[PDB]
């Protein structure tokens, strides 16, 4: 089986660098080149370059100014994209890719890699506050409520949210993340249930942040 | 520094209909690529060298074109169809991507259920104030966020956050969320959403009065 495996998620200050890994498997390393595209939150794809792997020729996109370096072990199998001096706005998405002959006998097979998340900002590790998106005590006999909680100033991504231990999912939505001013994420997560049994019913929003290994448990209910 | 401009930036459409999707080069390229993405995934080659299929496609995908103008085009369209297509050129370095077009479901119009939520006193304590507003459930995506504090239109205090078209019912819901601080916040009486939609005949107003 051919397989691209990238290196895990990055977090960056602004001017480090940063080094992804890209290890393939499953073919013969050294008969097809490999290339790199990145797609920042939200927006399209750009190309970075590309790289020979049997003698180490490269092409970049000249937008980085000589920021991305690529380099292969053929040891291991196993090609490296360094990008240097790094700005917020290198914060993206990065993959490797199999590259491809379109003057081959065959169908061409496609291989990406999963991926790997470089966050550059200056912001520190931070644990969310989390708070109650309270429904309106306002009742009904067979109307229905929203309720949430408001997972506010943490940093990086990513948070995970499930409701009632995961008992609770269908009409959940859990809202993807802002980047606020202040270069903290905040997100919502929301759910649809009967506005009767408001006070016997109990939901609790449970939210994850490994990366301050911050869990929270939050009951939300009416107010007053 | 060949652009590639895709058209339209959004494709709507039924399971079983056609999709025709265009890309146009600034300057005329060789052949033309196209790739699949799904949200979460890597882009997926579909077509190579502007009409030869990528192995395992599905032979519902057909591309085509010449000079500036290529198409790809779907036939009989499965919900395992609907992603953003990107067209790429390989012919002049460096290499350059189309900015993308969604394909999405077409489906009924679907109203918005709008939901208002004042901040907590916990967050109030900590000096700031958030108020959201909730749109559940609508379609299609157009829809319009209003905030108003004492009658004062907000501009630029707020952000608005969108779910995927989901896999169930094919509907958006949105969340926006006005930032107040707690000074401003408490120097204020009436917080309002005004939510505007085609599934609605009128806008429909959320609202509280603080401390109330």
């Known amino acids: 089986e051919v397989q691209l495996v990238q290196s895990g998620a990055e977090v960056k200050k602004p001017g480090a660098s940063v080094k992804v890994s890209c290890k393939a498997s499953?073919?013969?390393?050294?008969?097809?080149?490999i290339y790199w595209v990145r797609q920042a939150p939200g927006q399209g794809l750009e190309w970075m370059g590309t790289?020979?792997?049997?003698?180490?020729?490269?092409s970049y996109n000249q937008k980085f100014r000589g920021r991305v370096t690529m380099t292969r072990d053929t040891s291991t199998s196993t090609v490296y994209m360094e990008l240097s001096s790094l700005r917020s706005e290198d914060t993206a998405v990065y993959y490797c890719?199999?590259?491809?002959?379109?003057?081959?006998?065959?169908?061409?097979?496609?291989?990406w890699g999963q991926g790997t998340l470089v966050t550059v900002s200056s912001a520190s590790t931070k644990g969310p506050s989390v708070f109650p998106l309270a429904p309106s005590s306002k009742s009904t006999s067979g109307g229905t409520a929203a309720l949430g909680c408001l997972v506010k100033d943490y940093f990086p991504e990513p948070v995970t949210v499930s409701w009632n231990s995961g008992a609770l999912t269908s009409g959940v939505h859990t809202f993807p993340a802002v980047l606020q001013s202040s270069g903290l994420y905040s997100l919502s997560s929301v759910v649809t249930v009967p506005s009767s049994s408001l006070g016997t019913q109990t939901y609790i929003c449970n939210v994850n942040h490994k990366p301050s290994n911050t869990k929270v448990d939050k009951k939300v209910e009416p107010k007053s | 520094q060949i652009v590639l401009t895709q058209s339209p930036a959004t494709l709507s459409l039924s399971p079983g209909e056609r999709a025709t999707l265009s890309c146009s080069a600034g300057?005329?390229?060789?052949?033309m690529h196209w790739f699949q993405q799904k949200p979460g995934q890597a882009p997926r080659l579909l077509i190579y060298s502007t009409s030869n299929l990528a192995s395992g496609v599905p032979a519902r995908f057909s591309g085509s074109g010449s000079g500036t103008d290529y198409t790809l085009t779907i036939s009989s369209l499965e919900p395992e169809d609907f992603a953003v297509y990107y067209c790429?050129?390989?012919?002049?370095?460096?290499?350059?991507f189309g900015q993308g077009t969604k394909l999405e479901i077409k489906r009924t119009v679907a109203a918005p259920s709008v939901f208002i939520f004042p901040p907590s006193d916990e967050q109030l304590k900590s000096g700031t104030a958030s108020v959201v507003c909730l749109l559940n459930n609508f379609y299609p995506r157009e829809a319009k966020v209003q905030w108003k504090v004492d009658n004062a239109l907000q501009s630029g205090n707020s952000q608005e956050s969108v779910t995927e078209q989901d896999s169930k019912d094919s509907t958006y819901s949105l969340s926006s969320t006005l930032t107040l601080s707690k000074a401003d916040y408490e120097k204020h009486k009436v917080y309002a959403c005004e939510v505007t939609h085609q599934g609605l005949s009128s806008p429909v107003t959320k609202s509280f009065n603080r401390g109330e």
């Open positions: 790289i020979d792997t049997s003698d180490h020729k490269t």
């Open positions: 300057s005329s390229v060789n052949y």
């Open positions: 890719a199999r590259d491809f002959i379109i003057t081959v006998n065959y169908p061409v097979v496609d291989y």
């Open positions: 790429q050129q390989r012919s002049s370095l460096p290499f350059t």
């Open positions: 499953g073919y013969t390393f050294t008969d097809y080149w």
